[PDB]
Design a binder for these strands. Structure first.
Ligand SMILES: [Mg+2]
Ligand SMILES: [Mg+2]
Ligand SMILES: [Mg+2]
Ligand SMILES: [Mg+2]
Ligand SMILES: [Mg+2]
Ligand SMILES: [Mg+2]
Ligand SMILES: [Mg+2]
Ligand SMILES: [Mg+2]
Ligand SMILES: [Mg+2]
Ligand SMILES: [Mg+2]
Ligand SMILES: [Mg+2]
Ligand SMILES: [Mg+2]
Ligand SMILES: [Mg+2]
Ligand SMILES: [Mg+2]
Ligand SMILES: [Mg+2]
Ligand SMILES: [Mg+2]
Ligand SMILES: [Mg+2]
Ligand SMILES: [Mg+2]
Ligand SMILES: [Mg+2]
Ligand SMILES: [Mg+2]
Ligand SMILES: [Mg+2]
Lengths: 99, 110, 103, 101, 132, 129
RNA sequence: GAACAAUAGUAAGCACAAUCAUAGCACAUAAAAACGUUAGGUCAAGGUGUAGCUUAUGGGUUGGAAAGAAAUGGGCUACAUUUUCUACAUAAGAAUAUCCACCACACGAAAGUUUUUAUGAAACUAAAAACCAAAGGAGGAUUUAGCAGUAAAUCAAGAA
């Protein structure tokens, strides 16, 4: 090692646009901190779930508008029909417990 | 295939320049070796610049050729500390001012 | 009405709905008109700051970081260094109390 | 309707973690620096501590997209093994085949 | 016994398409693939989104075309445009068929914000590879 | 077909390398026949090789709840073809790669590396600072 | 409900077999493995039949857990000379449980205690040093696994 080596390295450093003045290994993290995309910002993170409200509401609309057809919702519906026709329904809010 | 065309790996620009095709001086050429370092392959004389840091590839191209021009312009500038050069820093063994020289002169003295 | 599949493709492409060939992944994104020396060299916004202080150590690491970053344009980097000016000058008391006079 | 209340709170954790993200990055820039004073770091400490803890990165949990299963999730497809296997076996998943060697 | 995606042996009368008559372990041996896209290759991205897209396209095509869908839906993805290929039974008159063709192409191009192309091939009765 | 000639000195390529990735072999074989026969007509003078295949294998638990002695093993194979073109122009490049790219199959992906020939930059020519 | 110098059996279907995969063969392994059995497992992957909850068996915030007197299954590391250290990759040098007052050392601390460092808003986590060097001296009834590139030993990689 030499002073010629230190000055050569500083030359390369300030030239290439890398870290110029000697720093700790610890502080260097902050370098890498702005050198990247932060974790919570990445599209592979915040865009993880497709919007469920979108598909759900869209297809339900398209259904009542008579375009899409949901056999699951028809099963459900028909079964709550035969559940309430029996007399066991879903109580109007506030009524069930105390009465 | 898919809705989006944006590819992260696109941006990377490489430059490969043979140092034999450059107008460099002895001093300029070897100060450049010591300056650039790892980007230099010593057997085939190929210099490689990988540029990333900018979003658009035009920018990685202009900054890579920028690095080229910059290293060439500062390879010819001799400064104060280059006269401070350690003999251990040498890529060569110069017969001048050597230890083998003083061993020879002492052996011939005796 | 359509005369051929090629007419289909042609119209989709004029409309900008079909993709552009031979594909460059950068098609449709101009990056604000910027060039590298607006990205790489951040000296412009390091003008106002104490020069020999450790604040330049911290801000040179911040700078060298925002330089290496393809993921952000000019604007947001500048907002970073500006928020840093605003916050560093926000507390005048801390900097002076710490044992170094800081501007 | 998101398939669970689980996926509800975690989605709100994705929005939030995107929102205070800049604050996080810039505060933790000073907080993790050695050269700067310890005094700016105690105050930066109270600062990221003050942020709502629903906006921090690590409070976020990776779940299967459709079936919400918290664990056994394949990172690349965001899908639980039950659903993955289901999809790939019908051949609805491209390129995925049964391994013999 | 391995129950993944299989059709059990009946009294021997159960009509079966070539598709459901082959166990998962046959995929790429005999069976082809239902969906085709770049995403699962060695160096590539966003397989997940092409998968979500696939799933919803299954749901959509089976709910939009009640009772007439013959065999499982073939998804192609090429140069950002999706070619949706469906083998469909003859039930409804051509009017409603083109209505729903245009309807689907429009709504799918516009939701997925990318050009969609729909190919329907009509078949007299469900194709039977085995039994019957 | 509108054609126009700009006075500017069109870009040269020493080696235009095209990587074609796939799952299946057959499609890449046929596509190879296609690119070869397309690059012969335009007198582009090309070669083709097969870069060795890469196989990824990962494992899932076979049952919904608990048997850990039982595992399903799933596989993804990526096969390669590489077209190597030498000594081509910029326009010849844009056309050939347009024709090759528009027709690219659905299961296959394509990665192109172009090594383009530049003489020297201006501030470097023969000044010294 | 079969006998091949054949006595009432013929039968497409589905297993096994055959082909595929292990980049050529052959083998091996991998895969495949019907019908049924064990009301075997899972309503916490998800979806639902039946019953229930609806100012609550619902939805949010905040803090709190996972302590060992034991008992045991599975592992890892050993108990040392086919060993231990450093060089190192496959000829080397030294150490070596009893001399004895060693200024203790031979193996064996993965455990503890200190200080760091990784990550993180939050160290209870993980890694590395220094110290410490304990049980352990090949283990009762009784048992696991393996027929070849296997066992055993040594090394790396990936998944989250
Ligand atoms: Mg977590
Ligand atoms: Mg089994
Ligand atoms: Mg074979
Ligand atoms: Mg065999
Ligand atoms: Mg087997
Ligand atoms: Mg078999
Ligand atoms: Mg068998
Ligand atoms: Mg039971
Ligand atoms: Mg349930
Ligand atoms: Mg129910
Ligand atoms: Mg509750
Ligand atoms: Mg809590
Ligand atoms: Mg015991
Ligand atoms: Mg072992
Ligand atoms: Mg052992
Ligand atoms: Mg020896
Ligand atoms: Mg220890
Ligand atoms: Mg000891
Ligand atoms: Mg002892
Ligand atoms: Mg025994
Ligand atoms: Mg073994």
């Amino acid at each position: 090692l030499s002073e010629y080596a230190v000055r050569m390295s500083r030359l390369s450093a300030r030239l290439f646009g890398e870290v110029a003045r000697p720093t700790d290994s610890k502080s260097m993290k902050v370098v890498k901190l702005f050198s990247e995309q932060p974790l919570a910002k990445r599209k592979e993170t915040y865009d993880w779930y497709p919007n469920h409200n979108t598909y759900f509401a869209l297809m339900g609309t398209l259904r009542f508008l008579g375009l899409y057809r949901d056999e699951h919702q028809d099963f459900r519906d028909e079964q709550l029909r035969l559940k309430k026709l029996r007399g066991k329904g879903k109580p109007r809010k506030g009524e069930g417990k105390r009465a | 295939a898919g809705p989006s065309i944006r590819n992260p790996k696109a941006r990377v620009v490489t430059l490969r320049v043979k140092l034999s095709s450059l107008n460099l001086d002895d001093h300029a050429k070897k100060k450049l070796i010591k300056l650039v370092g790892d980007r230099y392959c010593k057997s085939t004389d190929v210099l490689t610049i990988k540029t990333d840091r900018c979003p658009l590839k035009r920018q990685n191209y202009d900054y890579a050729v920028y690095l080229l021009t910059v290293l060439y312009h500062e390879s010819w500038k001799t400064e104060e500390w280059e006269k401070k050069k350690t003999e251990a820093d040498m890529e060569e063994y110069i017969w001048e001012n050597s230890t083998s020289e003083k061993n020879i002169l002492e052996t011939l003295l005796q | 009405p359509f005369q051929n599949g090629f007419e289909e493709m042609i119209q989709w492409t004029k409309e900008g709905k079909l993709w552009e060939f031979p594909i460059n992944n950068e098609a449709g994104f101009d990056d604000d008109g910027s060039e590298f020396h607006e990205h790489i060299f951040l000296d412009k916004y390091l003008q106002d700051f104490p020069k020999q202080g450790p604040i330049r150590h911290f801000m040179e690491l911040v700078t060298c970081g925002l330089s290496k970053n393809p993921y952000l344009s000019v604007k947001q980097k500048v907002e970073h260094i500006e928020w840093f000016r605003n916050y560093f000058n926000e507390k005048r008391v801390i900097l002076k109390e710490s044992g170094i006079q800081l501007n | 309707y998101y398939v669970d209340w689980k996926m509800l709170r975690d989605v709100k954790r994705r929005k939030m973690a995107y929102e205070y993200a800049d604050e996080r990055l810039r505060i933790n820039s000073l907080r993790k620096n050695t050269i700067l004073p310890k005094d700016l770091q105690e105050v930066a400490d109270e600062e990221i501590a003050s942020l709502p803890r629903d906006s921090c990165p690590v409070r976020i949990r990776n779940r299967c997209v459709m079936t919400s299963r918290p664990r056994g999730v394949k990172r690349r497809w965001r899908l639980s093994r039950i659903v993955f296997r289901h999809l790939a076996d019908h051949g609805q998943l491209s390129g995925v085949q049964r391994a013999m060697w | 016994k391995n129950r993944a995606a299989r059709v059990r042996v009946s009294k021997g009368d159960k009509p079966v398409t070539y598709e459901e008559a082959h166990a998962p372990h046959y995929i790429a041996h005999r069976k082809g693939w239902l969906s085709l896209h770049t995403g699962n290759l060695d160096g590539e991205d966003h397989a997940a989104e092409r998968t979500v897209e696939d799933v919803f396209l299954r749901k959509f095509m089976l709910g939009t075309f009640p009772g007439c869908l013959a065999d499982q839906l073939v998804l192609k993805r090429r140069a950002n445009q999706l070619e949706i290929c469906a083998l469909v039974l003859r039930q409804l008159p051509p009017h409603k068929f083109y209505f729903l063709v245009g309807y689907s192409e429009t709504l799918l191009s516009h939701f997925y914000k990318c050009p969609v192309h729909l190919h329907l091939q009509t078949v007299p009765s469900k194709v039977v590879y085995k039994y019957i | 077909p509108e054609i126009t000639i700009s006075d500017e000195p069109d870009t040269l390529y020493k080696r235009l390398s095209v990587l074609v990735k796939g799952h299946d072999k057959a499609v890449l074989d046929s596509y190879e026949y296609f690119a070869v026969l397309a690059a012969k007509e335009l007198g582009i003078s090309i070669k083709v090789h097969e870069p060795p295949r890469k196989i990824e294998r990962f494992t899932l638990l076979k049952s919904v709840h608990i048997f850990k002695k039982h595992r399903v093993q799933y596989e993804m194979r990526t096969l390669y073809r590489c077209l190597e073109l030498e000594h081509l122009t910029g326009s010849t490049a844009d056309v050939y790669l347009e024709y090759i790219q528009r027709n690219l199959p659905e299961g296959v992906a394509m990665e192109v590396t172009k090594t383009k020939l530049e003489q020297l930059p201006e501030h470097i020519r023969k000044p010294i600072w």
